[PDB]
Amino acid sequence: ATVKVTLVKSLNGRLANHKACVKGLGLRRINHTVEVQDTPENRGMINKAYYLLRVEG
Amino acid sequence: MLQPKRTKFRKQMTGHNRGLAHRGSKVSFGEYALKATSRGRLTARQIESARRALTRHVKRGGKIWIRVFPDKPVTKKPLEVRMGKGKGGVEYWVAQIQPGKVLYEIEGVSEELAREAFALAAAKLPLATSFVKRTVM
Amino acid sequence: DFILNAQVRSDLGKGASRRLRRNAGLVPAVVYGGDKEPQSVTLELREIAKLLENEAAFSHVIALNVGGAKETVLIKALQRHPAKGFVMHADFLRVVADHKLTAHVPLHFINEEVAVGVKQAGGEISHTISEVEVSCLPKDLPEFIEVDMAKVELGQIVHLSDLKAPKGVELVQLAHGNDLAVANIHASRV
Amino acid sequence: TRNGRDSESKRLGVKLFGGQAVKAGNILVRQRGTKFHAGYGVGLGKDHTLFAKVDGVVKFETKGAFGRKYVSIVAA
RNA sequence: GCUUGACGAUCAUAGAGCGUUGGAACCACCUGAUCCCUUCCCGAACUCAGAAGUGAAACGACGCAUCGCCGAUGGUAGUGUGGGGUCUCCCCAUGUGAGAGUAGGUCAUCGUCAAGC
RNA sequence: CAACGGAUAAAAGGUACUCCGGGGAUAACAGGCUGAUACCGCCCAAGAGUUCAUAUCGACGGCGGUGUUUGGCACCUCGA
RNA sequence: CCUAAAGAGUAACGGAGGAGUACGAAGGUGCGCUCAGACCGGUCGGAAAUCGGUCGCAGAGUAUAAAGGCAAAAGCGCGC
RNA sequence: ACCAAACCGAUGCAAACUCCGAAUACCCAGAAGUGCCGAGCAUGGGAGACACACGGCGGGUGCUAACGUCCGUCGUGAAAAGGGAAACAACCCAGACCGCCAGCUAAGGUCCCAAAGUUGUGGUUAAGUGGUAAACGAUGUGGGAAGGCUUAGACAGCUA
Ligand SMILES: [Mg+2]
Ligand SMILES: [Mg+2]
Ligand SMILES: [Mg+2]
Ligand SMILES: [Mg+2]
Ligand SMILES: [Mg+2]
Ligand SMILES: [Mg+2]
Ligand SMILES: [Mg+2]
Ligand SMILES: [Mg+2]
Ligand SMILES: [Mg+2]
Ligand SMILES: [Mg+2]
Ligand SMILES: [Mg+2]
Ligand SMILES: [Mg+2]
Ligand SMILES: [Mg+2]
Ligand SMILES: [Mg+2]
Ligand SMILES: [Mg+2]
Ligand SMILES: [Mg+2]
Ligand SMILES: [Mg+2]
Ligand SMILES: [Mg+2]
Ligand SMILES: [Mg+2]
Ligand SMILES: [Mg+2]
Ligand SMILES: [Mg+2]
Ligand SMILES: [Mg+2]
Ligand SMILES: [Mg+2]
Ligand SMILES: [Mg+2]
Ligand SMILES: [Mg+2]
Ligand SMILES: [Mg+2]
Ligand SMILES: [Mg+2]
Ligand SMILES: [Mg+2]
Ligand SMILES: [Mg+2]
Ligand SMILES: [Mg+2]
Ligand SMILES: [Mg+2]
Ligand SMILES: [Mg+2]
Ligand SMILES: [Mg+2]
Ligand SMILES: [Mg+2]
Ligand SMILES: [Mg+2]
Ligand SMILES: [Mg+2]
Ligand SMILES: [Mg+2]
Ligand SMILES: [Mg+2]
Ligand SMILES: [Mg+2]
Ligand SMILES: [Mg+2]
Ligand SMILES: [Mg+2]
Ligand SMILES: [Mg+2]
Ligand SMILES: [Mg+2]
Ligand SMILES: [Mg+2]
Ligand SMILES: [Mg+2]
Ligand SMILES: [Mg+2]
Ligand SMILES: [Mg+2]
Ligand SMILES: [Mg+2]
Ligand SMILES: [Mg+2]
Ligand SMILES: [Mg+2]
Ligand SMILES: [Mg+2]
Ligand SMILES: [Mg+2]
Ligand SMILES: [Mg+2]
Ligand SMILES: [Mg+2]
Ligand SMILES: [Mg+2]
Ligand SMILES: [Mg+2]
Ligand SMILES: [Mg+2]
Ligand SMILES: [Mg+2]
Ligand SMILES: [Mg+2]
Ligand SMILES: [Mg+2]
Ligand SMILES: [Mg+2]
Ligand SMILES: [Mg+2]
Ligand SMILES: [Mg+2]
Ligand SMILES: [Mg+2]
Ligand SMILES: [Mg+2]
Ligand SMILES: [Mg+2]
Ligand SMILES: [Mg+2]
Ligand SMILES: [Mg+2]
Ligand SMILES: [Mg+2]
Ligand SMILES: [Mg+2]
Ligand SMILES: [Mg+2]
């Protein structure tokens, strides 16, 4: 019911929409892993920034 | 030289040439055709030049259709003239060509003779061409 | 002969269909018509492209074999690449024993050497059309419609009402009160 | 050249969309002519302006003969 | 439950045409222009007083796909995001996805009130 | 008061005799980018060459190269 | 109006056109009515005048450019 | 016997054509979590700035020329060092509080200059192609689907 998310690429030069998607999950600097719920609102912020995150399920 | 008898407006923007030719890519009237496999634009003096070379070689019978009409005006600014100060006057007319458009058609001749004549014309055109027969669909 | 093999297609879409033509070398297809749900099938390009140079390819009746379940179909429409010219998509219409169907049938022009307008008057021959929309029962669907141009004079026009048809065959356009030039004779260009 | 002229833009279009709450006197659409017609609860200005006459919610319904597009105000 | 008249809902899958049929009641055409009223002239239209004729026209119902109007499945074009190429243009991954055309569908479906069986 | 947010009620020119403050924010010379133009190659082959397209030329059309003329731009230099 | 990238806005010595008015009724209201065009028939007018009929549905009209509108016609006529 | 409106069918084009018509973007409402502990708004003290540049995408102008010029929207420089692209503001990766003779990676790379595979498996090229450029031309070479002749003697040579 929860998913690991790790930021593996820099936030420099990304679209402001994608910057706020990463900040919306609570990720702040590279190689940071967070505990978030697998809810449809949260699952939609991951897909918008798929190329930046590494999802461990 | 082909060109419209009258136009609503004298000038046009440059525009862009994009996409394939899903319309105008079938052998409709004739029985052998010269299709375009690359995009570009014919300047209505090459269309006219390539038509001498095609009717002269058959020189006995046959019917020929031209499926391309140059209807887009283009402008050129004269020499030793700065930038700005309006838009230049119309010099010549062109036709937008996309990959797959059929240019010339012919019938009433042997298949071997059609191949010869369409090679005469294709050497006057600034784009790649092809030889296409006719199908039911 | 007129045999085609097919497999049941499962992945639909532009990306899935573009992958068949690039990697697998197959062709997407559809089998609709009759009284059934439409079925999406796939077939190999080099086999459909070999059935297509038969002269009576569209006006004949195919024996499609989807998986191991075969049936009766007919080439109803065809999609080709605008530039290269190979076939990309094709749809098949199911054939029912008692049901009217339509098709495109090419015209077999004959004996143009001894036409009166050519041997005597020194004129040309122009085929204005090369196929006719027909409508008939499947049992009497012709491979070709034969037009005879022996007794044709210079300047004489041939329309749909001039040519003969086999039994139980309608020319569709003629039924709409629209008969149109099939072929004609005219003087030489030069 | 004999061409360099134009006019100031007039800021036309829809001002309140479907579902938005409205008040009396609120302007809904600015038009030249009537792309949209005044429905229930809406009035028409002398320059073909649609303004709310009651409180509610925009509807944006098309109905009736002539295929007209209507703007009406409904209950909230 | 059925027919006719009035008022609506919905605006062609509901329209157009082509044939058949209805006058007991209703409606229409109809008789006349003294009165109310009318015509830039005219009882044609509007209006009044009616009950000798006909459902001819009009209207309504019922039939047919000929035109019209709807119209899938599949494929194609375009396209947001990320990455490439031979970079005037395209391609790959992923989400989205027409217009035209094909098979086909349609000779509408309801609501309130009043008269006659 | 149209120079249309209208300096005043009321206003044109010369300077090669000129002068000051500044600018490579902006021209003339030379350099750079480009290559329409210019020059030089090539593709097709109607034809001229008594016959014969290519000994020698070559229409109507097309594809390139070099910076090489006339230009385009305004990147360097106006405390030379 | 286009450029202008389907909310608003958006530059060029970019591509095209108009204004510096008119109306005491060309405004208000009530009542009434549908245009251009085609064909056929009719005294000279004849392709085109006024009249009759059929088809047509807005291809007419709107004081004035263009765009967007117009059957409760926003088009046309009369009384006050 | 030339032309020929009008109509029927077939067939193309349009920034100032539209019977149609997206993806995005924009407006609104209800919801979970995150926000560096705030983002939003209002009222006041102080400003600077109003000479922008290149790259991607959508366009006008030019020659779909220019490190040209004019707009819309993103990214970087301005005001951003470090590693890569040989050197190379604006390209790629990534945003420097200080120290360490510690480890793991990004783009890019691993024969020597010069840190790290003369690594492994199956093919291609003979051109130093790689390590610049078109129309067009050529028995270069690898792979694939098919065809026409052929022990009734096929294709080249030679004798009638
Ligand atoms: Mg980036
Ligand atoms: Mg342009
Ligand atoms: Mg098109
Ligand atoms: Mg895709
Ligand atoms: Mg203008
Ligand atoms: Mg202008
Ligand atoms: Mg403007
Ligand atoms: Mg505007
Ligand atoms: Mg009012
Ligand atoms: Mg009466
Ligand atoms: Mg349709
Ligand atoms: Mg679909
Ligand atoms: Mg689709
Ligand atoms: Mg569709
Ligand atoms: Mg002034
Ligand atoms: Mg001013
Ligand atoms: Mg002033
Ligand atoms: Mg002076
Ligand atoms: Mg002196
Ligand atoms: Mg000085
Ligand atoms: Mg000074
Ligand atoms: Mg300078
Ligand atoms: Mg200046
Ligand atoms: Mg010098
Ligand atoms: Mg210079
Ligand atoms: Mg210098
Ligand atoms: Mg060069
Ligand atoms: Mg000669
Ligand atoms: Mg030089
Ligand atoms: Mg120079
Ligand atoms: Mg500049
Ligand atoms: Mg100087
Ligand atoms: Mg000095
Ligand atoms: Mg010096
Ligand atoms: Mg417009
Ligand atoms: Mg806009
Ligand atoms: Mg927009
Ligand atoms: Mg601006
Ligand atoms: Mg003026
Ligand atoms: Mg008026
Ligand atoms: Mg009035
Ligand atoms: Mg008349
Ligand atoms: Mg009305
Ligand atoms: Mg358009
Ligand atoms: Mg217009
Ligand atoms: Mg803090
Ligand atoms: Mg402040
Ligand atoms: Mg302050
Ligand atoms: Mg300021
Ligand atoms: Mg400025
Ligand atoms: Mg500037
Ligand atoms: Mg700028
Ligand atoms: Mg700039
Ligand atoms: Mg650009
Ligand atoms: Mg540009
Ligand atoms: Mg351009
Ligand atoms: Mg610049
Ligand atoms: Mg540029
Ligand atoms: Mg920054
Ligand atoms: Mg600065
Ligand atoms: Mg840096
Ligand atoms: Mg560096
Ligand atoms: Mg370099
Ligand atoms: Mg370095
Ligand atoms: Mg390591
Ligand atoms: Mg790596
Ligand atoms: Mg060194
Ligand atoms: Mg080493
Ligand atoms: Mg090795
Ligand atoms: Mg080398
Ligand atoms: Mg090399």
N-to-C CA span, chain D? 57
| Three-class SS state of B54 | helix
Residues in chain B closer than 8 A to C126 (CB atoms): 63, 107-108
Question: Can you read off the two tokens belonging to residue D70?
Answer: 């209507």
HEC-encoded secondary structure of chain D: CCCCCCCCCCCCEECCCCCCEECCCCEEEECCCCCEEECCCEEECCCCEEEECCCEEECCEEECHHHEEEECEECC
* Residues C11, C17, C19, C22, CA torsion sign: positive
Nucleotides of H under 7 A from a protein CB: 8-17, 25-29, 31-36, 59-66, 68-69, 74-76, 92-95, 136, 145-146
CA triplet C144, C177, C136: central angle to 5 degrees? 35
- Region of residue B81 (phi > 0: left; psi between -120 and 50: alpha; otherwise: beta): beta
HEC-encoded secondary structure of C19-48: HHHHHHCEEEEEEECCCCCCEEEEEEHHHH
Nearest to C182 by CA among C100, C101, C105, C102: C105
* Residues C119, C122, C123, C127, CA torsion sign: positive
Yes or no: say if C99 and C39 are a contact pair by the CB < 8 Å rule: no
Residue with tokens 């829809």: D14
Nearest nt (C1') from B40 Cα: E88
Yes or no: say if C111 and C150 are a contact pair by the CB < 8 Å rule: yes
C and A touch per CB criterion (3+ pairs under 8 A): no
- D7-32 burial string, b = 16+ CB within 10 Å, else e? eeeeeeebbbeeeeebeeebebbbbe
Residue with tokens 């019978």: B61
Gyration radius (Cα) of chain A, Å: 10
Write the CB contacts of C8 (distance below 8 Å, at least 6 apart in sequence). Answer: C39, C40, C41, C42, C66, C67
Nucleotides of F under 7 A from a protein CB: 36-37, 43-46, 59-63, 70-74
Nearest to C22 by CA among C34, C30, C14: C14
Distance, Å, C46 CA → E50 C1': 90
Write the CB contacts of D28 (distance below 8 Å, at least 6 apart in sequence). Answer: D14, D15, D16, D22, D42, D50, D51, D52, D58, D71
* Exposed / middle / buried, residue A17 (Cβ in 10 Å: 0-12, 13-18, 19+): exposed
Q: How far apart are CA C36 and CA B131, in angstroms?
A: 42
Report how far apart, in Å, the C-alpha atoms of D67 and of each of B10, B11, C45, D16, D45 are: 38, 38, 49, 22, 22
Nearest to C155 by CA among C121, C111, C108: C121
Question: Can you read off the two tokens belonging to residue C23?
Answer: 């990697």
Rounded to the nearest 10 degrees, how much is the dihedral formed by the CA atoms of B44, B46, B48, B49?
160
Report DSSP state, residue B118: H
Quick check: C150 contacting B, CB < 8 Å? no
Give the strands of the sheet with A33-37, arranged side by side: A33-37, A2-7, A53-55
Identify the residue whose Cα has the smallest distance to the C1' of H94: A10
Strand H: which residues 91-110 of B lie within 7 A (CB)?
A: 96
Q: How far apart are CA C142 and CA C168, in angstroms?
A: 10
Q: How far apart are CA A29 and CA A22, in angstroms?
A: 10
HEC-encoded secondary structure of chain C: CCEEEEEECCCCCHHHHHHHHHHHCEEEEEEECCCCCCEEEEEEHHHHHHHCCCCCCCCCCEEEEECCEEEEECEEEEEECCCCCCEEEEEEECCCCCCCEEEEEEEEEECCCCCHHHHCCCEEEEECCCEEEEEECHHHCCCCEEEECCCCCCCCEECCCCCCCCCCEECCCCCCCCCCCCEEEEECCC
Question: Can you read off the two tokens belonging to residue C186?
Answer: 């005219």
What is the stated resolution of the deposited model, in angstroms?
Answer: 2.9
Q: Which of C58, C127, C186 to mutate to test the interface with B (most CBs of B within 10 A)?
A: C127
Write the CB contacts of C32 (distance below 8 Å, at least 6 apart in sequence). Answer: C38, C39, C91, C92, C93, C94
- For chain A, what's the residue count? 57
Report DSSP state, residue B79: T
Question: Distance from the CA of D33 to the center of ligand 67, in angstroms?
Answer: 77
Yes or no: say if A52 and A22 are a contact pair by the CB < 8 Å rule: yes
Question: Can you read off the two tokens belonging to residue B55?
Answer: 């009717």
Yes or no: say if D38 and D51 are a contact pair by the CB < 8 Å rule: no
Yes or no: say if C174 and C135 are a contact pair by the CB < 8 Å rule: no
Residue D43: what are its φ and ψ, rounded to 5°?
Answer: -120, 170
Cα C149 to chain centroid distance, Å, stands at 22
Residues in chain C closer than 8 A to B21 (CB atoms): 82-83
User: For C76, which residue in chain B has the nearest alpha carbon?
Assistant: B137
Query: What are the residues with a C-beta under 7 Å from any atom of nucleic chain G?
Result: B 9-11, 13, 84-87; D 1, 3-14, 31-35, 37, 48, 66, 68
Yes or no: say if B109 and B31 are a contact pair by the CB < 8 Å rule: no
Identify the residue whose Cα has the smallest distance to the C1' of E100: B23
Is the C-beta of residue B3 closer than 7 Å to nucleic acid chain H?
Answer: no
Nearest nt (C1') from C29 Cα: E74
Quick check: C130 contacting B, CB < 8 Å? yes
Is the C-beta of residue B83 closer than 7 Å to nucleic acid chain F?
Answer: yes
Residue D65: what are its φ and ψ, rounded to 5°?
Answer: -65, 175
Nearest to B96 by CA among B41, B57, B25, B135: B41
Question: Can you read off the two tokens belonging to residue C99?
Answer: 């049901």
Yes or no: say if A45 and A37 are a contact pair by the CB < 8 Å rule: no
